[PDB]
Amino acid sequence: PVARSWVCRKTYVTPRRPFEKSRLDQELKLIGEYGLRNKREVWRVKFTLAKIRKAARELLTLDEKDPRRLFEGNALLRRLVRIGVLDEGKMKLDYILGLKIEDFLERRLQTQVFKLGLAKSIHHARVLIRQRHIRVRKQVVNIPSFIVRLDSQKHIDFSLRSPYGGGRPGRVKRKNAKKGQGGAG
Amino acid sequence: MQNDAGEFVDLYVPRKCSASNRIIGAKDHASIQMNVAEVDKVTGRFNGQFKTYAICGAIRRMGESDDSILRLAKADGIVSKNF
Amino acid sequence: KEWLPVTKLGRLVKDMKIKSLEEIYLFSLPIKESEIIDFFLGASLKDEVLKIMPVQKQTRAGQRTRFKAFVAIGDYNGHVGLGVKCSKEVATAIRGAIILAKLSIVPVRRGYWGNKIGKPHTVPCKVTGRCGSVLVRLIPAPRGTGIVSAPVPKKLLMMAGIDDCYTSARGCTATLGNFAKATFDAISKTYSYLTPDLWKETVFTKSPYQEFTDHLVKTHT
Amino acid sequence: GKCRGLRTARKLRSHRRDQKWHDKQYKKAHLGTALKANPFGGASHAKGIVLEKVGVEAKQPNSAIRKCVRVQLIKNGKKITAFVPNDGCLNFIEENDEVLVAGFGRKGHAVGDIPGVRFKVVKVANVSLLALYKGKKERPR
RNA sequence: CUUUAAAUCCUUUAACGAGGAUCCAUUGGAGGGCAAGUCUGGUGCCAGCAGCCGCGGUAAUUCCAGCUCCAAUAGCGUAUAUUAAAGUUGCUGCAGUUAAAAAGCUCGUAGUUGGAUCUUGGGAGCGGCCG
Secondary structure, eight states: OOOOOOOOOOOOOOOSOSSOHHHHHHHHHHHHHHTOSSHHHHHHHHHHHHHHHHHHHHHHTSOTTOHHHHHHHHHHHHHHHHHTSSOSSOOOGGGGGGOOHHHHHTTBHHHHHHHTTSOSSHHHHHHHHHTTOEEESSSBOOOTTOBOOSSTTSSEEEOTTSTTTSSSOOSHHHHHHHHHHHHHO | OOOSSOOOOOSOOOEEOTTTOOEEOTTOTTOEEEEEEEEOSSSOOEEEEEEEEEEOHHHHHHTOHHHHHHHHHHHHTOSOSOO | OOOOOSSHHHHHHHTTOOOOSHHHHHTTOOOOOTHHHHHHSOTTOOEEEEEEEEEEEEETTEEEEEEEEEEEEOOTTSEEEEEEEEESSHHHHHHHHHHHHHHOEEEOOOBOSSSOOSSOOBOSSOOEEEETTEEEEEEOOOTTOOEESOHHHHHHHHHHTOOBEEEEEEEOOSOHHHHHHHHHHHHTTSSSSOOGGGOSOOOOOOOHHHHHHHHHHHHOO | OOOOOTTOSHHHHHHHHHHHHTSSHHHHHTOHHHHHHOSSSSOSEEEEEEEEEEEEOOSSSOOOOEEEEEEEESSSOOEEEEEOOSTTOGGGOOSSOEEEEEEOSSSSOOOTTOTTOOEEEEEETTEEHHHHHHTSSOOOO
């Protein structure tokens, strides 16, 4: 009898076919285009997309104008819109089945940071994110898997406590300046 | 087939047997499209128009194509009713 | 260098008095010249060999071995075909299989799953096909499901154009020839299945011969 | 299914249970004699003591004499055999040593050209055999 | 500093702290199943590899070593118990002439399953035959 959590849940499923050519090709292409550390992240994205798809199918397989169906569909569609995948003109339940994994990855913090025009390369964006360099709406962000929302899109830039956004320099510039000053005297 | 608007997505409509009301597939070479010409009542002459029939391969293979053609021609008004 | 047709259908398709092969399928005209498909279906036709089984027969002169090739060709828009050819040399066997697969292609039709919105994406019904001791059935799937099957039938279906489908096989799937023929027979009956959508009476368009006899009587003697 | 009556469930269940019981894998997994005859007794591993080293021949046209160990168990005193997997690892095993024995992996079935051997050696003298092969560790002396 | 019964842990901030950034990432494989060498050197039905087929007989792509290579990558291999694959336990949904399998035949108590036929139309109306 201890006050604990006991709640755990996986987030990925390993493909049943171990050695496939097309599957590896698509996974490698996605990792290369969007800068992923390993196949676990594309697997977790596939798992959550499959969960969303099966939930949509379960909601769709019932009759029209069912209050539970309408409530759950409206909630899920609003969640998808505020995440930033669907548009304002596509608010129908059957449009859920026509989503792509690239649509989910393009809302990643890493790729959005790379795209908005403050990092040279996507790997550069990821390494900038991981080393705590920029913030999201007056809050410092650290993890590139941050699912960026819709309203929280125009208020992300460099941080105040960063050498790039205006602040005290880092660890190498001060050391080089000290070395130069010591050499000068 | 239909859609939101109402247009057709089937790239071709297949044929259909005039006797057994069964459609004709693409790789069904036994199907026959028969043309029967009518005769003007005034004197008896060829005019230029015709009547088209279609029989699936199964009917001919089983051997009831001639009876079906006879029935179709009788119904259309070619074969005499008393016969 | 220009293609010389043999039958009068070749004359019609070469002289450009025909517009498409859809009515060729509609009238169920057999195809004997493999270049008609090339004329109609251009660079969008892709072929891929499946497997090579060296068949070996024994005689008084010792064992005799030759190769039989399986290949599937078809554009990714609704036309799919299979070809089988056996020859002494493997390369000539591949060419013959390609020619035979090009000669025999059956168009397929696709439907929707409940919500009839957009372009067709799945098999309209629960088609079936059996040859030898292999039975393959195709079940419609919602959008984005994919092609869940063995690699060879998945390749064949995605070559045909049916992106969403469910499959179920029974028997000796190890024999690639019988399994491929069964999954081709199952996909070749998607049109030959009377659906209440097609209950309308069909108007009999005149046969191409009956309309172009005035040209075929003077082209070839 | 043959009997399809709306009130025929007991007969169907009895026939199904009989046909399931008279099977092979279900019968093996649901009878006490199979586990009683198992040298381990349903355990994944079991320690033993070496009695003498023995060599065995081949079965298919694969002539190569292979060396095993005649090991006597500890829990029940059963005397079994054990194959030494890797190359030239028989020298690492001396007489009367603590050896951990595990099955080969085919569920108590002879494998390959080695007749009558269903086990293998994984640990000797509380030291892993893989470490003794790669030289990462060393057998105490 | 802060937290805390007092402390450790997390966060915050000073002062240091990286170029082969030696502040150096392993586990099983490279014949097919199953993604990856007719590479090089060594023993030659021996030593061994091998879940299966099989690889070794003086040119071994399969054994022993080096380079290269593929898979997951703070993780990977092995034994066991078990689930889907098993439409090889089949209620959905398996088979019984020749591959495993219809009692030698009939009667028969339980159990199971049982033919047809008993109810119908109009009145008024919301409305463009029928909502």
